[PDB]
Amino acid sequence: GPEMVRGQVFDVGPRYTNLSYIGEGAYGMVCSAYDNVNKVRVAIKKISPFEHQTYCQRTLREIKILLRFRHENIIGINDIIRAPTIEQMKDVYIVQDLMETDLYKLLKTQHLSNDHICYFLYQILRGLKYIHSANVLHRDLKPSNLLLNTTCDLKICDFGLARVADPFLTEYVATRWYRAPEIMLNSKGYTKSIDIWSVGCILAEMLSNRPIFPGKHYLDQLNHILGILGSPSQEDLNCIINLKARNYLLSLPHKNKVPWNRLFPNADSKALDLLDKMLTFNPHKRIEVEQALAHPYLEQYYDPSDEPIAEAPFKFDMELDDLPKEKLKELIFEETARFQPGYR
Numbered sequence: 001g002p003e004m005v006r007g008q009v010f011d012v013g014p015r016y017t018n019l020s021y022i023g024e025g026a027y028g029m030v031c032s033a034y035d036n037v038n039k040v041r042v043a044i045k046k047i048s049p050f051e052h053q054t055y056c057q058r059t060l061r062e063i064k065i066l067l068r069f070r071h072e073n074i075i076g077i078n079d080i081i082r083a084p085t086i087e088q089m090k091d092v093y094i095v096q097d098l099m100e101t102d103l104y105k106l107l108k109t110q111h112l113s114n115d116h117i118c119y120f121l122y123q124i125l126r127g128l129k130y131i132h133s134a135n136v137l138h139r140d141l142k143p144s145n146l147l148l149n150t151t152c153d154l155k156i157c158d159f160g161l162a163r164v165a166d167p168f169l170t171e172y173v174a175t176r177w178y179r180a181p182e183i184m185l186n187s188k189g190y191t192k193s194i195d196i197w198s199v200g201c202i203l204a205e206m207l208s209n210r211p212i213f214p215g216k217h218y219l220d221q222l223n224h225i226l227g228i229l230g231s232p233s234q235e236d237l238n239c240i241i242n243l244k245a246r247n248y249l250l251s252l253p254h255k256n257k258v259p260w261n262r263l264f265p266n267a268d269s270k271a272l273d274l275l276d277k278m279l280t281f282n283p284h285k286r287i288e289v290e291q292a293l294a295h296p297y298l299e300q301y302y303d304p305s306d307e308p309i310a311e312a313p314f315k316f317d318m319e320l321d322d323l324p325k326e327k328l329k330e331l332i333f334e335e336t337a338r339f340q341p342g343y344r
């Protein structure tokens, strides 16, 4: 019989058993389980995306990217379970290595020492160097997408919003607190710099255990950023390619910059120097991932020879942005066929 968890069907036996609830999101539920074949503990994500185009988009992107990436600081996909016909397929189960918690959950129970902050930040950036080396933008970095274990290993997860870097997207996004200003302003938002901004927001949150820019709505989000960075400079304005957005910024009152050492009076000055370089409004002036790894704050961990890169750029082999959900379901079926007995 199909194991049920909190009233929900988890049709994953007989290979995967002893399921325990972990959490849930907008269209799924995550459980730990035991893989009786490989004799290891796993996480199993039940996803039910097919009634919504944006949920299918996230599912297909996550599957395609995570099956191609291979890196210690990025979560893998071990297995994918789904029905043997497309008409029967209503759920997809993604099996991944089991991690113990995520940074969102950790920060609610614990303040982090400077040494924990430094090591987590290093692993985030080490994972991100590989992503960017593959010409990929993660686009949804945030504490809940950083998985942790008892050994303090960190893995980036959830590539549902990821896309190829390439200097109006219909998509499902849970929070904008970590989104770079050029995205909020709709100006050439397919730059690797948008991920560095998110990492800066994560670093700020580790330093204080509070999100730095917790906007209540779209406009309030921009006001949070400007209220700390201050009104943009002339050169800042000139890097906004969207004249409507430039016009909007010009109508706002002048705001003074808040010193980093005022917001974070008890933080290591090297962390604040790095933070300042990640939370730079102009994306062309924002620090790049390799330069961030090389910053004196991370000097005890920096090791280029042990910070590997992708063998080649990732490519989608097809444009997925505006496909109908029925097409996306066919693509998800085809992408998961390799995990079926009898594939090709």
Ligand SMILES: Nc1ncnc2c1ncn2[C@@H]1O[C@H](COP(=O)(O)OP(=O)(O)NP(=O)(O)O)[C@@H](O)[C@H]1O
Residues within 6 Å of the ligand: 022, 023, 024, 025, 026, 028, 030, 043, 045, 075, 096, 097, 098, 099, 100, 101, 102, 144, 145, 147, 157, 158, 174
């Ligand atoms: N491999 C894993 N091991 C352990 N827990 C996991 C794993 N993957 C996800 N989780 C947890 O499962 C729960 C559901 O997460 P999920 O619904 O996928 O959202 P998310 O992609 O991590 N980001 P968010 O949209 O803010 O919740 C969270 O409590 C995660 O920490």
Ligand SMILES: *[C@@H]1[C@H](C(=O)OC(C)(C)C)C(=O)[C@@H]2C[C@@]1(C(=O)OC)CC2=C
Residues within 6 Å of the ligand: 110, 113, 115, 116, 119, 150, 152
């Ligand atoms: C961190 C570690 C610890 O509890 O870290 C979390 C909360 C699990 C992330 C701990 O108890 C000490 C200090 C240490 C650390 O500074 O790692 C960089 C390692 C430990 C054994």
